[PDB]
Amino acid sequence: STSDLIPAPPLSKVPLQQNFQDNQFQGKWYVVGLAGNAILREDKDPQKMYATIYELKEDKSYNVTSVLFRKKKCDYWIRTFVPGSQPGEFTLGNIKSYPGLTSYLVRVVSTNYNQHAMVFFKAVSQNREYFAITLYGRTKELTSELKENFIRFSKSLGLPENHIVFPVPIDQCIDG
Ligand code: NA
Numbered sequence: 001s002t003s004d005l006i007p008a009p010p011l012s013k014v015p016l017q018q019n020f021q022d023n024q025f026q027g028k029w030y031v032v033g034l035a036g037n038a039i040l041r042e043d044k045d046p047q048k049m050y051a052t053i054y055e056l057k058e059d060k061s062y063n064v065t066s067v068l069f070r071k072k073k074c075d076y077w078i079r080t081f082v083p084g085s086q087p088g089e090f091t092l093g094n095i096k097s098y099p100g101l102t103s104y105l106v107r108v109v110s111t112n113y114n115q116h117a118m119v120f121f122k123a124v125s126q127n128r129e130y131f132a133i134t135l136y137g138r139t140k141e142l143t144s145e146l147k148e149n150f151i152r153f154s155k156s157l158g159l160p161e162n163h164i165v166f167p168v169p170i171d172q173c174i175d176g
Helices: 144-156
Strands: 027-036 051-056 062-070 073-083 089-092 101-111 116-125 128-137
Touching (some): 027 144
Antiparallel strands (some): 027 128, 062 073, 101 116, 116 128
16 A cells, blocks of 8 residues: 555644533534545545434443445444543544554534534544544535635645535435
């Protein structure tokens, strides 16, 4: 394998949502914007919109379920986010069960809980440092101001235009 990647930014360039409220952040979020160093715009087959459901457990970790529409079926990816060093920061639960994955970091950058959210991800897989940013939406659509702000923040982490994508809304699986 030979492969080139845009460097993961320093954590100082990734803000943290102040006084993060885990209870208010639960529920379904739509992925209305997706950016990252391993993410690429594919004009021939545009990425379809997928959803991620956060649900607080008793021990204050999240059962994180992502649901996407792939190959005419609904695929479900169930993961666990364990609370990290500061509120709004999380590490991946049961990391040993994922082969190659030596590191995983989640950081809630900004959110108003009832409309939108921005979450930063960083992961070292096979000694390759990947990072991504997701524009979460409570509905499938969001304003141009929020979308241009997501593009602005994505660029501030060294990501060009073609590494920023906006998944097209769909009705399959991500509703209900
Ligand atoms: Na990632």
